[model samples]
Target chain A: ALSTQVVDHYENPRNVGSLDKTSKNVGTGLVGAPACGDVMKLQIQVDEKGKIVDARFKTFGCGSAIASSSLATEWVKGKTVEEALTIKNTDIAKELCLPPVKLHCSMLAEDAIKAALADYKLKQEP
Target chain B: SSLRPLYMDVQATTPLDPRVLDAMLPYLINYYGNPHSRTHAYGWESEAAMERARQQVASLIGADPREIIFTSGATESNNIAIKGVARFYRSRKKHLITTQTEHKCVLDSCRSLEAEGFQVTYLPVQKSGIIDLKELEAAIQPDTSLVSVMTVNNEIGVKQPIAEIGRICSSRKVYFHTDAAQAVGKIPLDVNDMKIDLMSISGHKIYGPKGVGAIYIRRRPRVRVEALQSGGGQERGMRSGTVPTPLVVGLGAACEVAQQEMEYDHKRISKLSERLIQNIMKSLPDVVMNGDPKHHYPGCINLSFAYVEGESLLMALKDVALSSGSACTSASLEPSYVLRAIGTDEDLAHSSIRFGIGRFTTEEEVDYTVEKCIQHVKRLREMSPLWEMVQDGIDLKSIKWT
Candidate 1:
C-alpha cells in the first residue's frame, strides 16, 4: 500500500511539467535505465545566489516513482543546491515508510537530486 | 450487487460452491468437535466426517485415502513434501533436483536445504514453461534424493510434462514430487499414471475451503519423511494436528463435484476461455501472449501490452480484478523473475496482466471485460510518452540519454 501523502502527491503532483533544457537558470538531470524500465529526468531553476527557486521532473515508473519525484521537488524548493543534494534516499524512504520493494524508487529520487545538483555545479565552473 | 466487477481472478481464490457449503454447515454449526479427542462420541463423529472428506479428496487424484495427510495448505504440504523427503534421505543422498519455475514455497524450501549443506539443482524451463527433459536428465546425479516439480504453473497456467519428468526420476531411482494444486480437477492427473512418489494438492485452488490441503505419499515400501511439526501422532504420524472437520468436509465435497463434472466443466470453460482470448486479441494489437498457448490451462490468459505499465493499467481498470507482472504491484523491487526467465523483455514484463476465467464465468461478463480492457489499454497507452514516440517511429535506442 502507498502512503496517503505519497498517493496524494502522485495523483496531483506538484511541480509537474517540464522546463526548457537550454534555459540559463535551468539545470537538467537525466538518468535511469531502459533495461530496468525506469527512466527519470529532473530539472531545477537555480537563482544567481545558488538557491533552487523552482523544480520539476518527468518520470517513467510506477506510482511510487512518480510520488518520489514529486516529493523531491517539494523538498528542494527554497533550499540551497548543496543542502538539496544532501537529502538522502533513506530520508525519503523513512518519511514515506516505503516498503522494501519500493525502496529503489526512493534511491532513484536521491539520484535525480544529485544529478540536478551536478548540472547546477557544472554551470558554475569555467 | 449487480454493480460489482465480474470476479474473474479465480486463480487467486474461488467462491465457495453452494454444495460444498452445504456439506460443511453441520460440522461448523452443530457437530463441532476436536477430531483429535478420542474420549467422546462427538470427537469420533467428527473424526469420521474428516476421514470421509479425506477419501473424497484422495479419489479425485487417484490415490488411497490412507496416503492423504492433511496439512494447513499447499505451502505446508510443499515444505513437508520437499524437506521431508530430502531429510529422510539426507544420510544416503544430500542432493535434490527441481525446476526453476516451481512455486516460491518449493524454491524457498530448496534454498533452505542448500543452507544446511544439502545440494539442489534448479533446472531451467523451456520457452513453453515446461522443464527440458535433457536438463533434468543431466541434473540428476548419484546423490540426488528428490526431484520436485509442479504439474501446472500458477502464473502462466502452462501444464508441465510431469509424466516424462516422473519417468526420468523413477529411472534414476530418485523420489519424484509434483505440486498439483492447479492441475487437479482442471485437467486429468493420476498419481499412478504420472508415477509420482509424492504430490501436493491445495483445496482452495479447486473451489474448496482454504486451510485444508493434502499430501500423497505412495504406500509401497513406505516413503519416509520427517515431520516439520511434531505432536500427538496423527495423520498416520506424518502430519500431526487437530483436523478442522468443516474445512476438510468442504474440500471433500469440492473434490467429488470436480471429479463428476470435470469433463463438462472443462469443455464449457475452455470454450469460454477461447472467446475471452479471441476477443482480447482482436481488440488489442501487438499484445504478446506468455506460455504455450496450446498447452496452457483454459482458465488463464496472460498477455503483455507493450508501452504500458501493468500497475497503472490495473489501477485504471479498478473494476476488473487481475494480476500483474509489475514488481510494484507484486511487492518485489525486481520484475517477475518468472517472466524474465521466459524471455519477456523488461518493458513487456512490467506491462503483463493475467486474467483468470473460471467455472462460473458468464458470457456476458467475458464480453464486457473485453470491451473494458480495450478501452482501458488505449487510454493508458495514450498517456505514455514512450507510446507516442514509438508511434512517431522514433527509435528509443537511437535517442541516448546521458
Candidate 2:
C-alpha cells in the first residue's frame, strides 16, 4: 500500500551504496530495528561550506523502507546540514502516500537524517 | 479464470466447487419449503433434504445425524459452543479453560463469560505451536465446565493434539470443544474416534457456499447448550433461525466430496507444499516455515522471509491472492496473536506470509508463487542494508536502535 511515487523511487532508487563511512567528508548513519525486518544505512557527503554535497543509502527491508531511505538521500542533498535536518518524515510520508501501517518507513527516513547529521558533527570534532 | 490471479487464499474462503453448486441450484431455484413445517409435501421434501445434508456432515465427522445443528457459520457456532456450554452449567462450574491462540470469536466468547463472573484460564502453547498437555491438565479445575481449542489453526496451520486433548478432557469429565472449521473437511476427523464432545465446521472454508455451518454436539453424554438466540426453537433450540437451504445443500455436497477425495487431495497437496518449500529454500536462506513442521495441514504453508516485510511482499506479489495471517484480522497492522502465542520473534512475525493451497490449486500456481516470491525477496534484500550487515558478520540482536 504505497503511492506510485514510492514504487517508482523503490524500483529506481535515486542514489545507492556507501559514502565512504571512514572518509572525513562523509558521514554514515546505520540504524537497526527489532520491531520490523528493516535496517537502513544512510550516508551523506558534506562540502567545506557544511552543505551536503551528495547523499546515498542502502536498506535491507521492504520497498517502503528502501523508498524511505532513498527519499531521505534525495531530500538531504544540496541542503546545509541544518536545513537537511529540518526535512520532516511528514513530508516524506505525504509525498509517498504511505499507509498508516507503513508510517514507520517515514519515521525511519527522519531518523536517518538525524543520525547522518550527528555523524557529521562527530567527524567535525578534534 | 485465465485473467484472474491464482486462487491461493483457500484458508480465507475457498472457491465454491462445481459439485456443491450442482447440488444447491435446485434449492436456490425451486423446492422452497421450510424444513420446520410439519403439515405439507413441501415441508416433507425440505425436511428430507435438510436431514440428508445433516447426514452428510455427520458421516464425515462420524457422528449421528441428530447430533448436528445448523448455524450462520463457524463464528456463530464457536459462540454457541463456548457460550452455550458455559452458560448451561454456570451453576456448577464457574471456570472455563482454552488456549491463547484460538480464533477471536472463541477468545471473545470467554471474555464475555468472564464479565458474567466466570473464570477463564488461557493456557499457553509451547514453541512447537501446540498446547502443552500437562499444562492443560494442570489448568483444569473442579469447577471448570468446558475446554475449547481448535483442530487446526487458521494462521500457522498447526494441527493440535486433538485426540490427546480430548482424552485429557474426558478423564477430567470436562466438556471438550474444538473449532474444526479449517480441519474437518481438509483432514480425516472422526468425532467418536477423537472423543470430541463438540465441533464447529464452516461451509465456505471447505469449498461449499458461504453463510452455512454446522456444530456437532455429542449424543452419548449429551452436551448441553443454552440457546443464544430467542426464537421458534430451530436447531434443537440452540440456534434459532431458518436455515438457508441452498447453502446447507452446498455444505452437504462439499462434505461428501471431501469424504470421497480427502485421501487423494491430501497427497496432492503435500506434493505441492513440498515443491514450494524445496524450491524456495533452494534459492533463499533464512527462510523459515512457521508452525509444527510435521503436524500441520500441508495445504496451508506459512513462511517467514528474513529481512523481508510481509505487507510489502503481499503488495509485491499482487497477482497471487495470499494472506499474511487470518483474513479477519488482516485489516489491522499488528502481528498475529497466533504467531506471538507460539513465541515467534516480533520481527519474524511481521515478516511472515501464508500460502494456501486447495483442491483447485495447480502445480503451475505453486511454481509461479515460489519464483515470484524468491525474486521479490531477493530484490528487496538487495536494497536492505540489514542484509549487508548480516553478511558482514553483524549480530542483529546485538545492535540497539536509537
Candidate 3:
C-alpha cells in the first residue's frame, strides 16, 4: 500500500533521534497533533556559517509520515538555512509518490522545516 | 527462500481448504445441473449433493436439513432474516431489538426497517462489548417482533450470552435471530440447545467457497419470514435463486470438515493464541487487551500498544498480514465503533490492532509474528514523542496535545 521509496525510508530511516534542544545552535520544530494520529519533531543544528551541520527527526504516525520526516532530515542536512527554507512540501510529496489522501504528511514535513528555521532565527536575536 | 506473508487476518476470510475443493471438483466439472430441475438424473444427482450440503450445514448447528435456506452470503441471509421476519410480523409487532455491535449488514437492515416506520432499539453493550441481558429485556417492547444479536463479534471476538438471550426471547414470545457467520463452524452451536430461532452462516468464513451461506429457520415454532427474492421459489420460497452447485458442495464439505476438526483446531489455535499473547505481553509494557478476557474467542486477539500508532505498526509488520479493525472500515481513519461502545479511550482506540489466528496457522508463524511485533512496537515507541514525554514523568493529560 506504500511506495518502495516510502518503505525504504521507513525501514532504514536516516538521521533518526533528537539533537540537544537546549544547545545554542539547535532549533527544534514540533508539528501535528496526536489526536489527528500523527506528530513529527524536526531539529536542525546550524553552524556559524549558516549551513545546516546536522539534522534529526522523531515521528509518531503512519508509514508516510515517518517517510516524509526521514526524507526531510536527509534533504536538509547539507543545505544552507535559506536553501532548506525553499524546500516545499510538494517536493517531498513528489519524491515519495504520496497519494492525494496522504499529502498532509508532506505538508507536516514542510511546516516542521519552517518552524525549525523560525526558532533558529528567534534564538539569534540575543 | 520464499517470502510469503503470514496470514493473521482470518476474521476477514479464510483460505479454502484443499479437502473442500476436492469435494467440489466433481460437481464443478461433472454433475452440473440445476438443483431445482426434476426431469432427469442430472437434476437428481445435483439435488442430492445440495441436500447433503444442507444436511452437513444443519448437522453442525443441530437443525433439520430442511431448515437451512441457502443464499449468496451472510449479508443476504442477514437481510432475509432481519427484514423478512420484521415485515411478516409487522401487523401485530411493529418493533425490533438488536445490539450496537451487530455487523454492518444487520445494522443497515435495521436502519432500512426504520425507514419503513418500524421502531428499532439498538441495545447498548457493556464496557466489555457484551450486551447486558437486563438492558435487552428492558428494551423489548410488547410489539417487539425479533431480537437479533451476533454470537461472536467480528471485530472484537467477544462472545455474547447467546443462550441467555435466546431464553429471554423465547420466554417473551419474540423470535431471536443471530448473525453467527463468525461462529457457526468455529464454535459449538445448537439451535435447540441455544434456543436460536433463526441464524446466519457464511461459507467463506468457515473455509468454504465464497458466494454461499445459509439461514436456519426453526420449524416447531414455525418462524415465518417473507421471501426476499421472487423467482422459482427455491430454498422453500425464502430465497429464490439457483444455488451454485460447486460452491454448495464446497460449503457442505467445509461444514463436515469443520465439524470433525473443530476440537483439534480449537485446541491448537488456543495454544497458539496463548503463546502469542504471553510472549507479546512479557516482552512489551503498557499493552492493553481489548474485549472481555473471559468470554472471548481465542482466535481473534485485539491488542492496543499504548503510544504506538496502529497503521504504522501494521506497515512495519508487513511480513505478517494484519488489520487494525474490520476490513470494511480499515480504509478510514476513524476508530472502531465497537471499541467506542466498550468505553475504550480515543487514543487507545486509535492504537488498537487485531491479530487473528486460524486453523492453518503454525507455531512458527505465531513465534515469528510475536518477534516482529515486539521489535516493531519497541522501535515505534522509541520514536514517539508521547512515549518520550511519559518517560520524563509528564502526565499526558496536563499538556495539550496540539
Candidate 4:
C-alpha cells in the first residue's frame, strides 16, 4: 500500500533535549558506524533515582533514521532503565508505521538505546 | 487553432503509409490463401507473394530472402533469438552476456534462462545507454556463448555501437545478437559489416501491420537455434507456425520504403527534432534532455521536466501523445528501471516523458505541442506542494522531511 502519510515526522517529537552527563543516574548510548550507511547516538537522562526523566538522540542519515531515533527517545522517557531496555524496535516501527525498507533504521535505534543502557549498568557496577 | 491533433508517439507504432496500405489491400482481400499449401493455384500464388515480400524485407537489411524468418513482432523475435541461442548452446556454454537496457522481452528471456541454470551477466550501460566495450570484454568468459546488445534504445533513442561490439564478440569467438527493432528503419544496417550472427526487426515500428516482424539468422556455418514452439515446419524450423502472408507483405513493403527514403527522412526529421527542442527550451526552464544528443535517433526526445509529475503532464497534454516512466507492476507503481539505471533521481525519473515524432509530424504540430506543454507544466507546478515550498525559498535539502 502507498504510504499516504507525510514522508517525514513533524512537531516536537516525544523525546527532546539532552540528559545530564555528570549525573550518576545518566546513561549515554551511541551506536552506528559510518560504514553502515547510517549512524545514531541516543542518550537517556535518569533522575536522582533510576527513573529516566529525559531523552535525546542525534542521527546522521535519511529521514527514516531521524524518525526512528526521535521515536526511540519518546518511547524511553519516564520509564525505568530496565523498562527502557525492554522497548522494542518493532514498537517504534509500529509508531511510525515505517515502510518495509526503512524498518532497518528502526532496529538500529533500538540497538543504540540498549547499548546505552548497558554502558550505564557497567559504570555503576562495583 | 490547428485542426490536426499532433501524433507524437511513433516509436510505439507508426501510421501506415497510404502507399504501403494500397500495396497490401489485394493480399488481404483477393489473394488470401494458405501459402504453405502447395496443392492449389491459390496456395501457389500466395506462396509467390509471400516470397516476394520476404525478398523486399531482406533487401532492406541486405540479407538473403531465406534468412528472413517472420514472427508476430519484435517481442517474439527477441524471445526466439535469446531462448533459441540459450537452448542450443546450453551444454556447450552456460554463460550469456547482455546489457541492462535491453527491451523487456530480451531481459525476461535472459532471466528465464538464468532460472534454467544458465549464468547471465547483465552488463551496465553508460548514461547514454551505450555499453562500454571494455566492460563487455571483461564480462566475457570461456563459457560465454552469446552476447546480446540492442542497436537502438526504444525509449531514449540512443544508438549503441553494435558494429564495434560485434567486432569484439567475433574476435572472442562468441555469437553476437542485437535487437534492432528501433534501428532497422531509422538507420542504415549491414549485417555482414557488423559481424552480427543474429538480429531482430519489427514491423509496426515502421508503419507496417502490428503482428509481423522478422529475425535475420546468418547461414554461414549455420547458427544453430532451438524452436520454442513445435508444429508444422515454418521459418526454417526456427519458428514453427503458419505465417500471415498479408502482414508479411506489409512489413516487407514498409522496410523497402524505409530503405529508399532513409536519407530524406533523416534530414527532415532531424530538422524537426531540432526545431522542437529549440521551441521547448524557449518555453521551459530546467528541462534536461536525456540520452546522447548526437547519437540519438531524430524521432525521439526523452526529457526530464523538473517540478512536474510525469503522468499529470502526460494527462494534461491530451493533444500530444507521449510515453511515461511509471510501470504498473503487480498492482504497485514502480518508476522505470531504465531511468533509474541511468542515474535519474527518483523524482525526476518519475517526471520524465518520451515524445516520438515521425514521418507525418508537421512543424506546426511541434510548435503547438511546445506551447501546450509549457502551459500544462506551469499549471501542474502551481498545484504541487513541493514546488510551492521550493518557490517560497524553503531549502528542502537542509531540513529533513522526517
DockQ of each: 0.27, 0.49, 0.52, 0.03
Cα lDDT tens digits for candidate 1, B128-171: 77778888898888988999989888888898888898889878
lDDT tens digits, residues B1-402, model 4? 655457898888888987679878998898889889889988998888889989998898888888889899999989988999889988889999998888889999999999999999999888877778899999999989899999888888898898899899889889989999998878999888888988998998988888899899888747878888798888778788888888888988998889888888889899999988888877888788888897889798888777665655665676677777644221134457777667777667766788888888888888888888888777656434345446779764554432
TM-score for each predicted model, relative to the true structure: 0.85, 0.93, 0.95, 0.75
Isolated chain B TM-score per model: 0.97, 0.97, 0.97, 0.96
Judged by TM-score, which candidate is best?
A: 3
Top candidate, metric lDDT: 3
Question: Tens digits of per-residue lDDT for model 2 on A32-121?
Answer: 574656678899999999999998888755667778888889989899988998899899898888888778888988998888899989
Report the error of model 4 at residue B29, Å: 1.2
Looking at candidate 3 chain B, the ten consecutive residues that score lowest on lDDT are B325-334
> Considering only chain B, what TM-score does candidate 1 achieve?
0.97
lDDT of each: 0.82, 0.86, 0.89, 0.78
Model 1 alpha-carbon drift over 4 Å, by segment? A1-29, A41-58, A68-126, B1-6, B332-334, B397-402
Query: Which one wins on DockQ?
Result: 3
Question: TM-score ranking from best to worst?
Answer: 3, 2, 1, 4
**Deviation (Å) of A119 in candidate 1:** 6.4
Q: Please give the RMSD of candidate 4 to the true structure.
A: 10.0
Query: Residue B251: error of model 2 in Å?
Result: 1.1
Q: Deviation in angstroms for B332 in model 1?
A: 4.8
Q: State which candidate, 2 or 3, has the greater lDDT.
A: 3
Worst 10 residues of 4 chain A by lDDT: A2-11
Consecutive 10-residue window with the lowest summed lDDT within model 4 chain B: B326-335
